[PDB]
Design a protein around this ligand. Sequence first.
Ligand SMILES: *[C@@H]1O[C@H](CO)[C@@H](O[C@@H]2O[C@H](CO)[C@@H](O[C@@H]3O[C@H](CO)[C@@H](O)[C@H](O)[C@@H]3O)[C@H](O)[C@H]2NC(C)=O)[C@H](O)[C@H]1NC(C)=O
Ligand SMILES: *[C@@H]1O[C@H](CO)[C@@H](O[C@@H]2O[C@H](CO)[C@@H](O[C@@H]3O[C@H](CO)[C@@H](O)[C@H](O)[C@@H]3O)[C@H](O)[C@H]2NC(C)=O)[C@H](O)[C@H]1NC(C)=O
Ligand SMILES: *[C@@H]1O[C@H](CO)[C@@H](O)[C@H](O)[C@H]1NC(C)=O
Lengths: 159, 48
Amino acid sequence: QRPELKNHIDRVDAWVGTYFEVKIPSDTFYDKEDTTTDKLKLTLKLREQQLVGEKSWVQFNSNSQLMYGLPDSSHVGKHEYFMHATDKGGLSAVDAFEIHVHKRPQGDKAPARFKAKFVGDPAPVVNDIHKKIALVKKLAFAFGDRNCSTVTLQNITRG
Amino acid sequence: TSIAITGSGSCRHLQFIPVAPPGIPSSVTPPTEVPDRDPEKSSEDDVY
Ligand SMILES: *[C@@H]1O[C@H](CO)[C@@H](O[C@@H]2O[C@H](CO)[C@@H](O[C@@H]3O[C@H](CO)[C@@H](O)[C@H](O)[C@@H]3O)[C@H](O)[C@H]2NC(C)=O)[C@H](O)[C@H]1NC(C)=O
Ligand SMILES: *[C@@H]1O[C@H](CO)[C@@H](O[C@@H]2O[C@H](CO)[C@@H](O[C@@H]3O[C@H](CO)[C@@H](O)[C@H](O)[C@@H]3O)[C@H](O)[C@H]2NC(C)=O)[C@H](O)[C@H]1NC(C)=O
Ligand SMILES: *[C@@H]1O[C@H](CO)[C@@H](O)[C@H](O)[C@H]1NC(C)=O
């Protein structure tokens, strides 16, 4: 049978330069043949049923059933996405959700401002969101931190 | 390659990366105070 839906995702709150990660709730979708979300295939899609690109600032892993991302100020504001829940029966249930990306609330008056210059071209690092999230989690691990969202990159300049 | 830890916000007067800065700012020059007083006058025409 076609899977059914009970709870929606209202909206996702994100901030520019901050890494967010959301695990889908276990009661998000239901099917008479499956009864659980984890035993059912979950995908993320755009308005006309196109997946997120590799270079997009938000990605989502199906096996870890985990969405994640880090937005930029050129993508501040609203955005829309669809969650598609496909069972073994080849039938898809659909939910929609909206993501609000805000500017950094502290803004310009931060009491601390860390600055560092590295080696090599920043073009592949900026062009790759994978490199960006690896960098953020690597700073977080360098401080020994768990929640990598505590890093807020503010600006990168080619030198 | 390089790390530059700098203060801002409430840490405006603080720099924390040791670059060995020898900068010694000067002192503000003392401006002469100029109070304006306008008392009344009897006519200097009394002289003539
Ligand atoms: C931003 O800077 C703050 C520093 O204030 C970082 O938060 C700090 O994170 C460490 C964990 O790595 C906290 O250590 C604590 O140690 C005590 C010792 O008993 C323990 O009880 C705590 O459970 C924790 O392990 C430290 O307190 C915490 N500082 C706070 C809360 O003020 C933060 O990670 C930095 N974020 C970055 C660099 O993105
Ligand atoms: C963060 O990095 C950005 C980009 O490196 C810096 O913004 C840049 O600021 C310079 C200085 O004004 C801009 O140069 C000139 O801008 C005017 C318009 O303002 C333009 O007409 C000139 O042709 C010239 O490009 C530069 O455009 C601008 N880059 C942008 C906006 O993308 C910014 O200063 C850095 N901020 C910090 C805190 O490091
Ligand atoms: C990590 O930081 C976020 C702030 O976005 C906070 O909500 C979360 O509780 C922190 N993690 C822990 C384990 O406290």
